[PDB]
Amino acid sequence: STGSATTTPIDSLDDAYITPVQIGTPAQTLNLDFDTGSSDLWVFSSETTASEVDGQTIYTPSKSTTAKLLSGATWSISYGDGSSSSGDVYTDTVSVGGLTVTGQAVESAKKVSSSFTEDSTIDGLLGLAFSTLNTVSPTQQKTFFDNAKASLDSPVFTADLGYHAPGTYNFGFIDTTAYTGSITYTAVSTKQGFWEWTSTGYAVGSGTFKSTSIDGIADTGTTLLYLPATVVSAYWAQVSGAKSSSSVGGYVFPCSATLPSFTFGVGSARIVIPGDYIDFGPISTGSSSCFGGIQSSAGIGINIFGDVALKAAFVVFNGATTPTLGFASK
Template identity: 45%
Template structure:
């Protein structure tokens, strides 16, 4: 999980998204909508990612063979584009009758936790009330999450029905927050739903929501397609569980093997180019919807910055020329195909006449392909193989 936000007022504009998903079966889609008010902060985005992954450094990732299937069922959940592409969240219902929460979907973690009435200080959030759910089952085991930046949350486990886009997952283990730090209290989201593998749940042996969507037959294909919108194009987006949305990408999907041995969606990147200039080759990366920026290793980031004439701020961020007319896109090669981060996505934040780059570094031995990459490329995640399929998003 990663939070990259500061306190702000949230204005939500709900938009309806057309879906032409994989044929047949049950599908769950979560659309994303736009928030127009948030002011981005590149330094905060880097520090949050550093805190997220430095707490558990992993070995460089190596791809493993696999393929993706698209037969079977799915369902859709819309998500809000918060803070001009800072993070994306959708409505999730918990309990009977359902209580609705704003939940951040994060492929870089695997826990489902939510603010609850057990937390007296969580008053800025919608809080899950177990006394109002007839399907609530107490567990009592403790959980705790803490991050290198000092943010933390803790509480107890429980079980209840969790509904995603109309599909009701029965007996889903949830983590009820009894305490949370001030940084979480100022975030607009009420909780987080991890889409990583179950080997990195905070309490061992818990099935993730995707595990249960598959095992309970709510989706008949073990995949989910992710489309992240851009604020510059109206924002929004969707998570489509059990299939993928052919209207959200162009060209054909390319299969890329995934190394899930560390619980993450690890991929091997053959190269990164700026135009015809190769700036990095043969490195490992993580596909993470919960990281805002595109983060390279320290040495790789400096090489990318040099090509664009960007200035290192010494804190993981770079100042970049606001006039990008002479720039060329970043080109990633995965699975033998190329995927772009276009020129307009190279600027993340503008403060007066100063622009901050959407790429940086966080002292990690691998790259994080965060929302800067993912909002330009549609990704189908296959949990069973495991593998991903990637194609250029309609945003490009």
């Protein structure tokens, strides 16, 4: 089997991407944030505290003839940005782009933190990291990809995120018309539950490439590119007027600037992030200070290849017995 679904930016900055997902019988379609940095499929629901729902589409398990309460199971998750959610668990039929899993754990939110409430465009998350990170207790549950893997033509999914435009998540096949050149594959460590890999270095603009190992995670659920402070300082030093602002919470730059590109290494191959992809716009409405798309990871504990980096590439998440990642230009 295979599946193919279009993923669409939620706003004009590409802050996140939503992909329609069918849950239950008859289908209830919710727009979920596919997140290769987490491993829970959770939804706004008829159980979510009413004051914490503000425009999202909800899953109502009582209207699904295939929903079953997973007795005793609860979940609770906290994300790198400080947001959180928690609730109970149903199993139900879940389809993505024509690919159907029966018995998928659908984690129904009883509580969500303010940032989820305030984002009316995201109806929940669909985790695509390794199932060892799934938070369901007392019986940990499998991701959608883990459940589908054996049925797929090939045990892979691909992320093809657009810049200010729709893109595609495919399951079970690699669309050879979706990228240019060849795909370079690189080793993955699953020890932390992430799609964790080691970039071979970087370049700023037309500068020379610096060979240096940068361990980090391929995370579709993080907006920006978070890298060591040395690397980030070298990038922003090429932008007149750029500075790190403690009050804003990162590097800012004059909105009048033209940003240089940023290149990262994948083995001997190179992925070029155009400068425009690094512009996240005014820090507040009407400001001439703009927020940068490359930021320091020094306070995180891990480097994160988020959407800024991933949307410059066609990315293969290879879930074979020894997982690997593949990157191609496009």
